[PDB]
Symmetry: none
């Protein structure tokens, strides 16, 4: 339990989430996790699975995509942001992520507008490794 | 059929549902249905008595009472929220409600955490009438 | 023939069945019946008398009680439920009933567990009249 | 007794249940079972066979097939869900299952709408093995 | 000839059968008969008088008692039951009768076990008149 | 005496009963029996010998067929079921049987409607051997 980072994503985009978690593990962040890792299919529909992904993850990494426009995804973004804001501490746990496959032109107007004025992480940037190192510092959250 | 709004509640808090229904009908919302309105006696245990409430109601209202922490209540909230999200149109069908008989501190984490960022209605608030008027606009979905 | 509703009950609790029939007819359900109405005396121990009660009734009302725990009662519940489920049409027929003589905590574990997935028609409820009116709407079964 | 998991299926899909049991045992879950193993012939139509399957199993697995749209199947789903939700312990045992012979569009409204908000186990996905290993952890229910 | 009902009784219990017949015809059943009504002193023995009683009666009423346990009584019960069952028509005619002079605890295993599967009428019952009216209806069989 | 299982059958279908007894003894149930092992034209009458066969057999197997529709057959089924249900012990012994010579569509409606609640064993099923093994376990009734 208490994984380092979790990758919230749409149901269809499984390969993108797997690639991103593998890459972030490769760059030097141990104990990688994804939404479909604690997405416990025995009955945890969206109450226990989503709250387990939010609560038991030091960093919540939202994965924007053209398929991230669905209403369920927007509700997940709202839930993650509100949990981050209400929870004591946790300055910038929610980290918007732009995958390599995605482009800045496919940002969801309805969904990604909530994250427009928040610190983003991009894969197209050539400073991506330094951004990851700065974000995932040795000192982090506790139990 | 096709009632304007339905109140979801626990088994014990039967009277609170009727009280809130009468109060909300007083404000000027016709067809004040409740969970016991379509709680058909035979055949249904949770098959359509929980589904006809979701299916045949324009707005769904969840009473966040102290008795609403039951294990069945969490499944009811999950079903309502997921049916709202899968359904097309009317993004804010699901509405948390806080009757005077309950308190904001009485919000049990397990169930209230599902509705941390939703359209909350509070009887403790003094702008209740304006919130009700804004939420229950003259135009109400379709058949 | 073709009675509106019948009451299945243990042999000992005939008076409770008569009382429930009288009360339910008083509420506005005509042509009330009971098991002893078609509990024919010649021969038909449980072969066709029970079949006459099941087939020739629009609704079946099991009278749960402390004397309803015997093996014969369990077979009666099993047969009524299976006949209702296999029958064409008539989505909801078997109506669990809790008379004032018994208590909600006095449910027999062996028998009442079969109906644990069905909504009861509780006499103790303050909404009993509305439940009865809702369960017995003018449009009903036929031949 | 006290089987690890039981597969609830329709009357016409015994072969699918046996195949799924064999596959799930192959993944590394010992002491498998199916509904046609505690489906004792002498009596026990749905009284002490379905209830025995519900009570004497750790993980109830509903097999969402094409023949699973019958009224009997809907009653079985209601019984399983309500028995799981009412009883203390057994946190989230009930597991919807999607076999090969079914389709993502096979979800009939009447039966699958009950589990629509509930999360399913789909072996169509490529993460099925890890998903199952996550489901049936070594620590589980007691007697 | 062709009496409505016939009372079959032990040789030593003529008074009980006569009292039962006298009580019964007053309720509205005309042309009452008993075994001693067709029981000729000369010529006929047992096979002829008993067969005449079986053949020339619309209904046959066995009268269970403590003196109804002899081998002759068992033979009479068996003969009457088999004649009713084999003969085409007459859907159900054999009626077990429990008079007040006997008790339910006084059911001799041998003779009563033949009619254990059949349903009876008890003089101890409080719905005796209605049961009798249900048995003997204005429409009946003939030969 | 005290035969392990008996087979009640219509008089016309003697061969089917013997064949079923031979098969079921072959599967591994020792000391088989049939109705014509405690059935004599001389001495005991039909009802008496049927009652003798009911209570001297650990298991009772009704052999449904097209010739099992007569009123005598219905009375035998009623008597067997009622004797099983009323007697103390023996939780469930009346086992509906479906042999090769019949089909699950030609079942006697009037007779088999009594057993529609219970579970039958079909030779048509491919799990017949497992059903028999689960049925006739080493531990069984006692004198």
């Amino acid at each position: 339990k208490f994984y380092n980072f979790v990758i919230l994503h749409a149901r269809a985009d499984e390969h993108i989430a797997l690639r991103v978690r593998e890459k972030l593990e490769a760059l030097g962040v141990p104990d990688g996790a994804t939404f479909c890792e604690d997405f416990q299919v025995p009955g945890r529909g969206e109450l226990s699975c989503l709250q387990d992904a939010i609560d038991h993850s030091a960093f919540i990494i939202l994965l924007l995509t053209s398929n991230f426009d669905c209403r369920l995804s927007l509700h997940q973004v709202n839930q993650a942001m509100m949990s981050n804001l209400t929870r004591q501490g946790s300055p910038d746990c929610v980290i918007p992520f732009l995958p390599l496959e995605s482009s800045p032109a496919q940002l969801s107007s309805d969904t990604a507008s909530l994250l427009s004025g928040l610190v983003r992480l991009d894969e197209h940037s050539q400073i991506f490794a330094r951004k990851v190192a700065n974000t995932f510092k040795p000192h982090r959250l506790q139990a």
